[PDB]
Design a protein around this ligand. Sequence first.
Ligand SMILES: *Cc1cc(C*)cc(C*)c1
Ligand SMILES: [Cl-]
Lengths: 245, 17
Amino acid sequence: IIGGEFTTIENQPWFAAIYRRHRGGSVTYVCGGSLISPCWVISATHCFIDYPKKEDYIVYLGRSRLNSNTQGEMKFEVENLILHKDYSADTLAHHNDIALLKIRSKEGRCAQPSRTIQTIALPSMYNDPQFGTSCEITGFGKEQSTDYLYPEQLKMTVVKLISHRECQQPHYYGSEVTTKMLCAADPQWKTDSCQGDSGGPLVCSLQGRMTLTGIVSWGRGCALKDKPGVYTRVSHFLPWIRSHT
Amino acid sequence: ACSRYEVDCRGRXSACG
Ligand SMILES: *Cc1cc(C*)cc(C*)c1
Ligand SMILES: [Cl-]
């Protein structure tokens, strides 16, 4: 996350931190995700498309730090890893950038609600907040585009929803943005998602409900003028989510 | 170069492609 502030998992308790294990037991971060039910985390297919074997992945909930453990965290295996069979990416945009992970502890259990872990509601079909609405994104992604390191502490920031019309300008992304995507950015262009933030949540209040409006997917650079964040538009993937869940 | 240890290797900001 460019800009924004350090937070803790208690302020984003639906945030899931997804890791890959290596032949030598080295564990590296992959991407973020969101807890949408006790056994299900939603994320982005592009995060997994190169190493699609569920066995390599670990998922943490209740976790506030990237390479250290935090009190109140819970560790899960991936029982099912479901990618979107129409995933594609031209050179910039990612289409159908959405994935599900069924999580299961070693005792065979799913998440339980606590101080650090809660589910995030999905929107009802085709229901997005109005443009101008202030939303939250969270992740362990880069703090600057040029960094080689990732912050150790969870961050969040606020961004505003942008109309397709406005996002579909030449000097933004044009028709590179489809109707199954959604743009958000800082009016002053100082805060944004970046590498490592993908799969993570874009959360808005909608009908007095904290709601998973988007999933961090793509964008040109990070916090670049006229280059908003581009998010999988969850309210247009309900059938896919019901049919796999 | 960019490896299998790389975080979110197809994320915005990544050198892939
Ligand atoms: C080096 C590398 C790694 C991944 C996961 C993807 C691309 C394009 C390049
Ligand atoms: Cl599919």
